[PDB]
Amino acid sequence: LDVCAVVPAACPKQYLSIGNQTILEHSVHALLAHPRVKRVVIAISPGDSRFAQLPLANHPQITVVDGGDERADSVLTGLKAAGDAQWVLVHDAARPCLHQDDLARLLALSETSRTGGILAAPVRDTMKRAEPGKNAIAHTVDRNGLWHALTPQFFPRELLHDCLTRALNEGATITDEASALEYCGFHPQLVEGRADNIKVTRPEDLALAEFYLTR
Amino acid sequence: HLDVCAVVPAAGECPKQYLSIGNQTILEHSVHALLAHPRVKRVVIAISPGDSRFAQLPLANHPQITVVDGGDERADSVLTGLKAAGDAQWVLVHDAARPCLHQDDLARLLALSETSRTGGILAAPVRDTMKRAEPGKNAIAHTVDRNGLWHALTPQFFPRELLHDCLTRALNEGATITDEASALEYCGFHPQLVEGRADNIKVTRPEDLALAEFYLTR
Ligand SMILES: [Cl-]
Ligand SMILES: [Cl-]
Ligand SMILES: [Cl-]
Ligand SMILES: [Cl-]
Ligand SMILES: [Cl-]
């Protein structure tokens, strides 16, 4: 039942701090919380100097690898260092607000499924599609069965390995890990997660993450 | 010439618009965000026949608030509201449950009246990766392209004439109506997407309430 986590961490928002720790430390620590998660593999770009100065740089359950050209190389590098783990948990560096109950709910999949899946949250707003290249609404987009893709993303290590290898080599346009499976013809599951599992991308996200984390 | 009428559909177990943040209900917070703009000379609130929550708010007697009666759909309500709209050449229709509207977004939207013959809505680009589930199932069909994908927000700002007609023609014809702009779209019209802040949220859920309180304090 052993699980390796992989964080593609590769002035970056994961090195911003909420209180005690960086966003990167919150995210990582939320994964290490769950007992099935034995190690966390963190991809870091070789330019990155901030990582080495954090306590996580010498934590015994963390391994660092050189991040690659794209998200997907990093993750493949991470998989290759997951040792002997059979399932693999991919998590964004900048998602520090993960709860243990979505995480446990996601981890339940290694016994119910052969594909794996992702945390996600149903879409609530009414969605519009712009006229291509324009300022103007073309039509309303149907939101039933529309989901926000979140992370962690939880998969059989070898399946992940195979879908990523093929999409990188065929030069497919990859966004999340789930999209690499999709590209190879798989259909990973949507596990409903809390909507407060946000990615800190803009200045004001930081205030929000902090709000969410203290709640 | 530049005077604007605002319409707020307030119908359709506690209704969330009547949840409170500090002093006021959501509705009061929303309506007040409308009243602040110089151009918003009045707000017409559509309230349903048998509701005793409204008359108890400072709003049941504001000099710039007209009440009118609720309808069976959001669409009917607004149509009702436009009759109370006076001599306004443009109508601003806003959710009662969207209390966090900021002034700078509203002035960008109002500006359209100078520029558009269609009008437009506040919106926010989608920044997240979106998935479509297989129908009736809980697995990813595919990734939905977020390029040109936008959250629809309010207010929605339209010329009163065009708003009246497209809402009319869409109800008469049995169109699937979600928001005012979608009454326009069914009628073959293409209203502008005006970007506003993403903290313009809708209070529906229970956890929704504290996030709004946070955003209001900001
Ligand atoms: Cl927790
Ligand atoms: Cl949403
Ligand atoms: Cl003005
Ligand atoms: Cl403001
Ligand atoms: Cl989003």
Gaps after which residues in chain B, C–N over 2.5 Å?
A: 12
Q: Are A119 and A91 in contact (CB under 8 A)?
A: no
- For residue A40, what are its two tokens? 């966390």
- Which resolution, in Å, applies to this structure? 2.4
User: Is-cis flag, bond preceding A152, omega within 30?
Assistant: yes
Containing structural domain, residue A149: 1-215
What are A173's two structure tokens? 């346009």
Measuring CA to CA, how many Å separate B78 from each of A64, A133, B26, B37?
A: 58, 31, 19, 21
Burial annotation B62-98 (CB, 10 A radius, 16+ → b, else e): beebbbbebbeebbbbbbbbbebbeebebbbbbbbbb
Q: Give the number of A-B residue pairs with CB atoms closer than 8 Å.
A: 122
Q: Identify the helix (H) or strand (E) that includes residue B215.
A: helix B208-217
Q: Distance between CA A204 and CA A211 in Å, rounded? A: 11
What CATH number is attached to the domain comprising B83? 3.90.550.10
Determine the length of chain B.
218
Q: Could you tell me the CA-to-CA distances from A171 to A188, B130, B166 in Å, in that order?
A: 21, 21, 46
CA atoms of B175 and B186, how far apart (whole Å): 7
Nearest Cα residue to A118 out of A84, A85, A92: A92
CB contact under 8 A, B181 and A136: no
d(Cα A137, Cα A66) in Å, to the nearest integer?
A: 43
Return the axis-axis angle of helices B74-83 and B160-172, rounded to nearest 10°.
140
How far lies A86's CA from each of A79, A83, A114, A154, B74, in Å? 10, 9, 12, 11, 52
Q: Do B152 and A201 touch (CB under 8 A)?
A: no
Three-state DSSP state, B18: helix
> Is the CB of residue A182 less than 8 Å from the CB of residue A190?
no
Reported as type and span, the H/E element at residue A164 is helix A157-170
Q: Name the residue type at position A6.
A: V
Name, in order, each residue with C-beta under 8 angstroms of A190's C-beta and a sequence gap of 6 or more. Answer: A117, A118, A120, A147, B131, B133, B138, B139, B140
Residue B38, judged by CB atoms within 10 A of its CB (0-12, 13-18, 19+), counts as exposed
How many domains is chain A partitioned into structurally? 1
What separation in Å is there between the alpha carbon of B86 and the centre of ligand 5?
Answer: 38
CA distance A16 to A9: 13
Query: Of the candidates B188, B184, B4, B211, which has an alpha carbon nearest to the alpha carbon of residue B88?
Result: B4
Compute the nearest-CA separation of B10 from chain A (Å). 18
- What does the alpha-carbon distance between residue A172 and residue A145 come to, in Å, rounded to a whole number? 25
| CB B106 within 8 Å of CB B38 | no
Amino acid, single-letter form, for residue A53: Q
> Which experimental method was this entry solved with?
X-ray
Of B123, B149, B210, the CB nearest to A141: B149
Asked if A127 lies within 8 A of B214 by C-beta distance, the reply is no
